[PDB]
Amino acid sequence: MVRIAVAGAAGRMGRNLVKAAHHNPVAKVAAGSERPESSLVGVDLGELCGEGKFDVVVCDDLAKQIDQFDVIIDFTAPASTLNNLALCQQYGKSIVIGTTGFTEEQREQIDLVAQQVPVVMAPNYSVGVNLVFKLLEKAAKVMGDYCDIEIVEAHHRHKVDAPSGTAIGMGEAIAGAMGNKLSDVAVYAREGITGERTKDEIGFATIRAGDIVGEHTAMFADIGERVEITHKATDRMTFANGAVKAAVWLHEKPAGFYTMTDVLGLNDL
Amino acid sequence: GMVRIAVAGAAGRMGRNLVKAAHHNPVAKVAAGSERPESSLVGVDLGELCGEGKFDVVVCDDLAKQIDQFDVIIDFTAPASTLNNLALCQQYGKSIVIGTTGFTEEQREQIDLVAQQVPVVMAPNYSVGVNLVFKLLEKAAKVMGDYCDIEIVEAHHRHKVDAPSGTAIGMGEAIAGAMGNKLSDVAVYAREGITGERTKDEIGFATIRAGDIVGEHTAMFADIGERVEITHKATDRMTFANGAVKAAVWLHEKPAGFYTMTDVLGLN
Amino acid sequence: MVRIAVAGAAGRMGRNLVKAAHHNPVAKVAAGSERPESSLVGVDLGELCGEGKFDVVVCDDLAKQIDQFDVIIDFTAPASTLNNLALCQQYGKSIVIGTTGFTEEQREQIDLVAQQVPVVMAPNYSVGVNLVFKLLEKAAKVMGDYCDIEIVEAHHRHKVDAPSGTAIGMGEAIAGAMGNKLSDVAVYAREGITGERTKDEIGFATIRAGDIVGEHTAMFADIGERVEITHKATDRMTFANGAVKAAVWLHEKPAGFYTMTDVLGLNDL
Amino acid sequence: MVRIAVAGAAGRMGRNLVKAAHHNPVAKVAAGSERPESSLVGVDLGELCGEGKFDVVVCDDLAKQIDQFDVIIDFTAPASTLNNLALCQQYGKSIVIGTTGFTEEQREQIDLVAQQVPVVMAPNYSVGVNLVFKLLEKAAKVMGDYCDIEIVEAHHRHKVDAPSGTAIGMGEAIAGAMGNKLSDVAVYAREGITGERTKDEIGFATIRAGDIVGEHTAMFADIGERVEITHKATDRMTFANGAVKAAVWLHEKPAGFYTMTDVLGLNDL
Ligand SMILES: NC(=O)c1ccc[n+]([C@@H]2O[C@H](COP(=O)([O-])OP(=O)(O)OC[C@H]3O[C@@H](n4cnc5c(N)ncnc54)[C@H](O)[C@@H]3O)[C@@H](O)[C@H]2O)c1
Ligand SMILES: NC(=O)c1ccc[n+]([C@@H]2O[C@H](COP(=O)([O-])OP(=O)(O)OC[C@H]3O[C@@H](n4cnc5c(N)ncnc54)[C@H](O)[C@@H]3O)[C@@H](O)[C@H]2O)c1
Ligand SMILES: NC(=O)c1ccc[n+]([C@@H]2O[C@H](COP(=O)([O-])OP(=O)(O)OC[C@H]3O[C@@H](n4cnc5c(N)ncnc54)[C@H](O)[C@@H]3O)[C@@H](O)[C@H]2O)c1
Ligand SMILES: NC(=O)c1ccc[n+]([C@@H]2O[C@H](COP(=O)([O-])OP(=O)(O)OC[C@H]3O[C@@H](n4cnc5c(N)ncnc54)[C@H](O)[C@@H]3O)[C@@H](O)[C@H]2O)c1
């Protein structure tokens, strides 16, 4: 039975994760962390998510609680996540990564450690998004070669990274299905005189507003018609339940880099 | 090689685009066109109609008079007219691409029957995007359909006489079919007054009629916590027209049968 | 500081109102009521909305807590609301009425009491929706005569009525601004062969799905262009925030019958 | 009858303008221009827009055709438009400007010449958009102070400037109604780690794809709800008819800087 450590347990996602893990009857909330400076250190995890007392308190370092957990679920910040990844390599732990805003260099590192450590990494833990990735592949094979491809996303006012990890995942799925690398084609900004659109570019547009949990649209546009595939997230618990499910799934596995497509058995769709 | 095309209702919205599309397809010849006997456009050059010079082919009030001139009829008119053309095809060994929508169940049965003796393409939509969308709907329905609410919304221009659109119904059929169901067992086409709580299995249809909208379609798969929307937007009727001409070129070879755009595009 | 009494504090709206009043920094949650039968009598208001202990408990009669509050916010049932209105008259209090389903007789009584008591009454308390109604009037005056008008709405799977009361309110605002009665022009369903659209009809399309809190769009469509005005509700709290805003506004206002148009200053635009 | 000179008559807009001016019974198509390089110099204007033969040919300089026209309609490029504006000043002509992508310095210059030349300038010649500007003012007064404001637009693959002039016009209307300058608050791109959104920023997101004639959405987002005002253009003829109407209106007006709001009588909506 999976013992879970929630990194950054006081965060928007972290609180939902504690709750999701608590109510998943195949998982146990065994540990949680916060920034060393943070005041919420020493607080009961249950009191933090507003559901009684679990007898587990928030720590400033997961290395101190190594004997309590099997898997870390990490929706924090990239530097922090990399530390946890290092911790996993050293102590034989596993990790589910939700954090976004990694540089290309950092993702290379994650891939490397993933050869020794069991890792789930996805930019989105919802079923709908992972379905959408497969749908994008198919749309890209049929329409990609002669159509303009644009990705639009909206998120709440607190999101620190643009474009979102999910939007990038969408671009990668598309580019990958067309035998391309996203970074060869992506355009992340348009200001002033940009000239005519290039044929191959994948454009990204970003909206930051209110409490929007997450909207994503991929557009394939021809002269005379267009196809738009959209996902809208209503509740963070969707992501949280999905990540706890990935952790439960990951507990049974060897080293490797896994996606939610692997967890959900969506690879052949 | 060359397919000679007859465009039924050549002065119509679709008809004008079809003349143009057949002209531009290099494997096709615009050979004939028809209009209602009442119509003031009878005797007009087809080229003038779509604004592309003079073709030396004029609009007639009956395609039976031009039987020697064409191999395939492309028909986006009205159901009675289309049935008449279908009969013409049976009598004279011609082929037909049907775009017309708003057929009754009885009329669709007749079409299937004649399709046993005549080569027929019939599709709810002739665009590549829509046919792609149908395949995407199948996939979405297999993963999300059993647990999610399914709704179809469509918008069209103020002149459209049938609701919901043939395309929206085609989307419903693709979805229902992929889930091992019949669309008519689950479809709800109207909601007025107190309807009660939504049933789990129903597929809801909502219809918008406005302005000059060429065609928008959205299929929504909605769960508690998230939703997926797959949308198609048509900007130009040339999308439909090019696809139908492509179907006609394809159909010219062929023996008798009932064919879809899936058969034409090999998208199965 | 406006001291607020929330009638029917255990209700869907009531819980959100307690929370909204707590969060508004110009308002204090001072009292709350429930039906005398209710098992929630004597419960802390804060525990009720999961906001901690407020030191204020639910009572079965607001007359017992008269010294604690200035304004009542009432989203209950018509009989109960009329009782509170009477209470306001007797003890010199004010009221924000959210309750609907009054008979014409009852509305006449409300108007009578409103001569002596400060009263806000409206069919919708969301700032966005009230704003949208005003915008619809304007759009209808400029584009309504020659454009096709369509109203589209989406709601969750539990909504039993179609179209929604809000969608109808939108149709009424539009029709009213054009010197028409909605029921003369409205079309609520389209099935089979309907013929060409009429010039003056207002079409309604209704979507029922998932957990959608409420989306409304009004479209004005011409040949060559269209204008769409949309409201999206993300959380039912939005209505609660509007009513608390009305209560703050109503405080220290003299006797009168007021609407959300008065609260939002919507005539002075 | 107003004699119209169409600058850049072979362009997307230019061809529509020739056609629009031809069909407007109060206007006539008297002249048209193209780049001196252009192979369309010496071509009949009518043949260019596919409407028979007008007996008027495209020239490389409108100064040569001064005696043929009263008003120039200019949807070209900023340098070209400024040259035409200079021509108007010298020869006593009038101008309707559609061109977008002017710098703030260039707009100051336009304002200056507009003191002695009759000028209509707008980023959009459709009725719907000019309506939308007025609606945005109202929405900004009610929701702007406490909501996140985002503007999104889509256009076809050939558009060279981002964001669109219309999107900027929307931003200006909003900012202006709130007693702000757009350039103080506008954010035109978001890439990498941007941090949390500021309270006052107005975000712009830009989509370039296919044959999209023009879509614009302004969003006002709160916690719990959001309002979206959208305009969609279906045909360039909408813009073209509007500009020809402005030209007809402008003919015989005195010097001044005029908008479509003046032409349409929308100032006191
Ligand atoms: N993959 C997905 O499905 C998905 C879904 C939602 C959010 N996200 C991403 O997850 C991340 C979390 O977003 P959020 O809104 O929860 O952020 P947040 O700011 O609400 O929470 C992040 C938390 O991590 C904590 N933290 C930072 N550094 C730490 C360290 N060294 N040790 C322990 N704790 C630390 C912070 O104190 C904070 O409480 C973001 O990168 C976001 O983009 C991913
Ligand atoms: N399958 C698709 O992809 C698709 C796409 C567009 C339209 N449609 C359908 O195609 C049909 C045509 O639509 P439209 O918008 O072009 O309509 P329209 O009314 O503009 O044109 C139809 C034309 O058919 C002509 N017509 C009718 N009866 C006739 C007869 N007996 N002989 C000769 N001409 C006749 C009419 O006079 C008219 O000019 C509709 O049923 C519409 O729903 C289908
Ligand atoms: N104007 C608006 O924006 C708006 C929005 C939603 C609902 N409403 C209206 O508000 C009312 C309440 O809606 P709801 O969804 O909260 O209903 P609800 O049934 O969830 O809540 C009503 C509450 O009122 C309480 N109540 C009834 N009589 C009472 C009394 N005498 N004393 C104390 N409490 C009493 C009930 O116990 C219940 O808790 C309805 O009339 C509804 O039509 C208005
Ligand atoms: N205000 C509005 O309503 C509105 C609507 C549509 C487009 N626009 C704007 O109008 C402009 C035109 O866009 P378009 O899509 O028609 O572009 P386009 O490139 O298709 O057309 C521009 C034309 O102007 C010509 N031109 C350039 N310099 C010239 C010169 N010195 N003399 C003569 N001709 C010259 C070009 O050769 C070309 O034919 C853009 O700035 C666009 O943003 C404005």
Ligand SMILES: O=C(O)c1ccc(C(=O)O)o1
């Ligand atoms: O895809 C993402 O990056 C993503 C999903 C959710 C969030 C967030 O809230 O920050 O970010």
Ligand SMILES: O=C(O)c1ccc(C(=O)O)o1
């Ligand atoms: O799918 C359809 O029914 C459809 C597509 C387009 C039209 C139309 O113009 O009426 O109808």
Ligand SMILES: O=C(O)c1ccc(C(=O)O)o1
């Ligand atoms: O607002 C604009 O800038 C605008 C309106 C139309 C176009 C275009 O076609 O490029 O650009």
Ligand code: NA
């Ligand atoms: Na558990």
Ligand code: NA
């Ligand atoms: Na041809």
Ligand code: NA
């Ligand atoms: Na004219």
Ligand code: NA
């Ligand atoms: Na200011």
